[PDB]
Design a protein around this motif. Structure first.
Motif, PDB file in Angstrom:
ATOM      1  N   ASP A  61      61.986  42.699  30.368  1.00  0.00           N
ATOM      2  CA  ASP A  61      61.958  42.309  28.953  1.00  0.00           C
ATOM      3  C   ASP A  61      63.093  41.370  28.540  1.00  0.00           C
ATOM      4  O   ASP A  61      63.147  40.953  27.396  1.00  0.00           O
ATOM      5  N   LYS A  62      64.086  41.165  29.405  1.00  0.00           N
ATOM      6  CA  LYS A  62      65.278  40.396  29.010  1.00  0.00           C
ATOM      7  C   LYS A  62      65.168  38.923  29.447  1.00  0.00           C
ATOM      8  O   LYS A  62      64.306  38.555  30.227  1.00  0.00           O
ATOM      9  N   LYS A  68      60.832  49.077  37.569  1.00  0.00           N
ATOM     10  CA  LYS A  68      61.545  50.293  37.865  1.00  0.00           C
ATOM     11  C   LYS A  68      62.852  50.104  38.674  1.00  0.00           C
ATOM     12  O   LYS A  68      63.324  51.031  39.342  1.00  0.00           O
ATOM     13  N   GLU A 112      66.066  50.333  37.724  1.00  0.00           N
ATOM     14  CA  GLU A 112      67.070  51.337  37.439  1.00  0.00           C
ATOM     15  C   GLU A 112      66.848  52.628  38.198  1.00  0.00           C
ATOM     16  O   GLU A 112      67.758  53.448  38.282  1.00  0.00           O
ATOM     17  N   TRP A 140      71.478  46.623  33.063  1.00  0.00           N
ATOM     18  CA  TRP A 140      70.718  47.666  32.385  1.00  0.00           C
ATOM     19  C   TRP A 140      71.611  48.077  31.232  1.00  0.00           C
ATOM     20  O   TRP A 140      72.793  47.697  31.176  1.00  0.00           O
ATOM     21  N   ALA A 141      71.068  48.829  30.283  1.00  0.00           N
ATOM     22  CA  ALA A 141      71.905  49.458  29.281  1.00  0.00           C
ATOM     23  C   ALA A 141      72.912  50.386  29.991  1.00  0.00           C
ATOM     24  O   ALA A 141      72.563  51.099  30.953  1.00  0.00           O
ATOM     25  N   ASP A 172      73.673  53.404  29.537  1.00  0.00           N
ATOM     26  CA  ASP A 172      73.466  54.867  29.672  1.00  0.00           C
ATOM     27  C   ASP A 172      73.185  55.291  31.134  1.00  0.00           C
ATOM     28  O   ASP A 172      73.461  56.421  31.510  1.00  0.00           O
ATOM     29  N   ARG A 173      72.688  54.376  31.965  1.00  0.00           N
ATOM     30  CA  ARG A 173      72.374  54.686  33.361  1.00  0.00           C
ATOM     31  C   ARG A 173      73.666  54.625  34.270  1.00  0.00           C
ATOM     32  O   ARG A 173      73.659  55.156  35.400  1.00  0.00           O
ATOM     33  N   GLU A 225      72.743  46.463  21.611  1.00  0.00           N
ATOM     34  CA  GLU A 225      71.311  46.491  21.264  1.00  0.00           C
ATOM     35  C   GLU A 225      71.087  47.649  20.298  1.00  0.00           C
ATOM     36  O   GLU A 225      71.512  48.754  20.581  1.00  0.00           O
ATOM     37  N   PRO A 243      60.733  57.173  24.705  1.00  0.00           N
ATOM     38  CA  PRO A 243      61.357  58.008  23.659  1.00  0.00           C
ATOM     39  C   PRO A 243      62.440  57.257  22.970  1.00  0.00           C
ATOM     40  O   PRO A 243      62.872  57.652  21.915  1.00  0.00           O
ATOM     41  N   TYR A 287      64.048  62.031  30.374  1.00  0.00           N
ATOM     42  CA  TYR A 287      62.788  62.410  31.014  1.00  0.00           C
ATOM     43  C   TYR A 287      62.186  63.590  30.265  1.00  0.00           C
ATOM     44  O   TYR A 287      60.966  63.685  30.105  1.00  0.00           O
TER      45      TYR A 287
HETATM   46  O1  LIG Z   1      58.865  58.971  34.304  1.00  0.00           O
HETATM   47  C1  LIG Z   1      58.177  57.739  34.230  1.00  0.00           C
HETATM   48  C2  LIG Z   1      59.095  56.790  33.513  1.00  0.00           C
HETATM   49  O2  LIG Z   1      60.441  56.804  34.209  1.00  0.00           O
HETATM   50  C3  LIG Z   1      61.236  55.620  34.154  1.00  0.00           C
HETATM   51  O3  LIG Z   1      61.905  55.477  32.868  1.00  0.00           O
HETATM   52  C4  LIG Z   1      63.019  56.369  32.579  1.00  0.00           C
HETATM   53  C5  LIG Z   1      64.326  55.591  32.927  1.00  0.00           C
HETATM   54  O4  LIG Z   1      64.382  55.574  34.398  1.00  0.00           O
HETATM   55  C6  LIG Z   1      65.628  56.233  32.302  1.00  0.00           C
HETATM   56  O5  LIG Z   1      66.787  55.358  32.393  1.00  0.00           O
HETATM   57  C7  LIG Z   1      65.414  56.441  30.860  1.00  0.00           C
HETATM   58  O6  LIG Z   1      65.244  55.138  30.234  1.00  0.00           O
HETATM   59  C8  LIG Z   1      65.933  54.938  28.990  1.00  0.00           C
HETATM   60  C9  LIG Z   1      66.950  53.806  29.226  1.00  0.00           C
HETATM   61  O7  LIG Z   1      67.940  54.287  30.345  1.00  0.00           O
HETATM   62  C10 LIG Z   1      67.662  53.493  27.944  1.00  0.00           C
HETATM   63  O8  LIG Z   1      68.522  52.328  28.094  1.00  0.00           O
HETATM   64  C11 LIG Z   1      66.552  53.042  26.883  1.00  0.00           C
HETATM   65  O9  LIG Z   1      65.964  51.903  27.496  1.00  0.00           O
HETATM   66  C12 LIG Z   1      65.751  50.769  26.652  1.00  0.00           C
HETATM   67  C13 LIG Z   1      66.741  49.657  26.804  1.00  0.00           C
HETATM   68  O10 LIG Z   1      68.069  50.286  26.455  1.00  0.00           O
HETATM   69  C14 LIG Z   1      66.434  48.491  25.956  1.00  0.00           C
HETATM   70  O11 LIG Z   1      67.178  47.354  26.340  1.00  0.00           O
HETATM   71  C15 LIG Z   1      64.850  47.952  26.133  1.00  0.00           C
HETATM   72  O12 LIG Z   1      64.605  47.646  27.532  1.00  0.00           O
HETATM   73  O13 LIG Z   1      64.092  49.140  26.127  1.00  0.00           O
HETATM   74  C16 LIG Z   1      64.229  50.269  26.918  1.00  0.00           C
HETATM   75  C17 LIG Z   1      63.215  51.384  26.460  1.00  0.00           C
HETATM   76  O14 LIG Z   1      62.001  50.819  26.900  1.00  0.00           O
HETATM   77  O15 LIG Z   1      65.593  54.081  26.752  1.00  0.00           O
HETATM   78  C18 LIG Z   1      64.928  54.545  27.885  1.00  0.00           C
HETATM   79  C19 LIG Z   1      64.156  55.783  27.389  1.00  0.00           C
HETATM   80  O16 LIG Z   1      63.030  55.149  26.526  1.00  0.00           O
HETATM   81  O17 LIG Z   1      64.269  57.178  30.648  1.00  0.00           O
HETATM   82  C20 LIG Z   1      62.962  56.717  31.118  1.00  0.00           C
HETATM   83  C21 LIG Z   1      61.933  57.847  30.779  1.00  0.00           C
HETATM   84  O18 LIG Z   1      61.783  57.687  29.387  1.00  0.00           O
HETATM   85  C22 LIG Z   1      60.390  54.337  34.396  1.00  0.00           C
HETATM   86  O19 LIG Z   1      61.195  53.205  34.207  1.00  0.00           O
HETATM   87  C23 LIG Z   1      59.309  54.189  33.401  1.00  0.00           C
HETATM   88  O20 LIG Z   1      58.652  52.906  33.555  1.00  0.00           O
HETATM   89  C24 LIG Z   1      58.400  55.453  33.540  1.00  0.00           C
HETATM   90  O21 LIG Z   1      57.608  55.494  32.325  1.00  0.00           O
END
Ligand SMILES: OC[C@H]1O[C@H](O[C@H]2[C@H](O)[C@@H](O)[C@@H](O[C@H]3[C@H](O)[C@@H](O)[C@@H](O[C@H]4[C@H](O)[C@@H](O)[C@@H](O)O[C@@H]4CO)O[C@@H]3CO)O[C@@H]2CO)[C@H](O)[C@@H](O)[C@@H]1O
Length: 370
Positions: free
Chosen positions: A14-15, A42, A44, A62-63, A65-66, A111, A154, A341
């Protein structure tokens, strides 16, 4: 599988990867080493897998939080900038990429989700969540809808859940207490019940995802959506007359998005640490490096003070900063991914009727605290 002599960068799809590619080209132009920018699906989740092997990218975006979890697995080099460079970025963005007192990444951008609305269809956006059902029924009379946003992730729903008091982990002394989790308190339950009532009464659908919501908005079918700065680009090409404003309140309280700091970390297994530092500090984190990325997909409110000073006149950046101020900077502790999760499951189960709100969130609290 080191290679050496090149840089490989992963950044999410998305970036502004094509912009970051431009910046890579210039570095290659006056330094001679090639930079390939990729955006795996995927990434991260992949990173802790491949880099564990001693493989993967030199640089990972990545943001923040990871980034605690990666640091805890010793996957990231400690970064080292002189007081001069540190002075070029806002201090609170450094705090976010500190793990155990060490710096583990460079901050790039701050963000926060905003409300985005179609001015033509809706001159004044609602000030409150509570007035959205009524607004939807007016609009449906004309074959439109009030609001569609990604419900699968979420991150997009958290601002409503947090509004009346939900929280991830309580901050104690300097610690987060990982046993004091606020996803099942009265505040969180209130917020998720509201959303579920929106679906029960057909004001939106449990299945709406990122694509569905983006298409509905950009065709002018829904009057509102909730998204972050990376989405602005696609709206501009649709020529929808849009504004970006504060999120609606819920029970009188501000919505509280989790604020993310886009960060870049260097793989501890990289043979290219020096080249990585050079690219980041001297090419990317300059007014010229940041605008090239921003041009592709907007970054938000950027960590580098000189460029932010230029960006801050934009009413969109102003709104982004206003929602960030009402929100809270995410923890970077390893337990954040566990948090996410569980909550993701709770929302999807609640929204789809597989579980009641109370059951969904109680499970999530149990899953998170063990
Ligand atoms: O279980 C199936 C899903 O698992 C995977 O998604 C996970 C990630 O691995 C986790 O890191 C977390 O994701 C967070 C994310 O870490 C956090 O930064 C925020 O992400 C934002 C981002 O900050 C922002 O820049 C823009 O990109 O949007 C992102 C949200 O889309 O929030 C995330 C939580 O919504 O948790 C998820 C599980 O929710 C896998 O990547 C998925 O594709 C899969 O559905």
């Amino acid at each position: 599988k080191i290679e050496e002599g090149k840089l490989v960068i992963w950044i999410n799809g998305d970036k502004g990867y094509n912009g970051l590619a431009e910046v890579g080209k210039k570095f290659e132009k006056d330094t001679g080493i090639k930079v390939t920018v990729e955006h795996p699906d995927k990434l991260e989740e992949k990173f802790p897998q491949v880099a564990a092997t001693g493989d993967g990218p030199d640089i990972i975006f990545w943001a923040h939080d990871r980034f605690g979890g990666y640091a805890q697995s010793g996957l990231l080099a400690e970064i080292t900038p002189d007081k001069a460079f540190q002075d070029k970025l806002y201090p609170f963005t450094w705090d976010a990429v500190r793990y155990n007192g060490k710096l583990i990444a460079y901050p790039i951008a701050v963000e926060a989700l905003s409300l985005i609305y179609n001015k033509d269809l809706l001159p004044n956006p609602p000030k409150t969540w509570e007035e959205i059902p009524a607004l939807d029924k007016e609009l449906k009379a004309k074959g439109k809808s009030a609001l569609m946003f990604n419900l699968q992730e979420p991150y997009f729903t958290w601002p409503l859940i947090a509004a009346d008091g939900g929280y991830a982990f309580k901050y104690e002394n300097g610690k987060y207490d990982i046993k004091d989790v606020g996803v099942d308190n009265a505040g969180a339950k209130a917020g998720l019940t509201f959303l579920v009532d929106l679906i029960k009464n057909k004001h939106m659908n449990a299945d709406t995802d990122y694509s569905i919501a983006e298409a509905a908005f950009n065709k002018g079918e829904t009057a509102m959506t909730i998204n972050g700065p990376w989405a602005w680009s696609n709206i501009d090409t649709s020529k929808v007359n849009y504004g970006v404003t504060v999120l609606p309140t819920f029970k009188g309280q501000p919505s509280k998005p989790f604020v993310g700091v886009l960060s870049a970390g260097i793989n501890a297994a990289s043979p290219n640490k020096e080249l990585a530092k050079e690219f980041l500090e001297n090419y990317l984190l300059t007014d010229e490096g940041l605008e090239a990325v921003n041009k592709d997909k907007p970054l938000g409110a950027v960590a580098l003070k000189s460029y932010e000073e230029e960006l801050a006149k934009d009413p969109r950046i102003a709104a982004t900063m206003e929602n960030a101020q009402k929100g809270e900077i995410m923890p970077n502790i390893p337990q954040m991914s566990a948090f996410w999760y569980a909550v993701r499951t709770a929302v999807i189960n609640a929204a789809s009727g597989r579980q009641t709100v109370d059951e969904a969130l109680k499970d999530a609290q149990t899953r998170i605290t063990k």
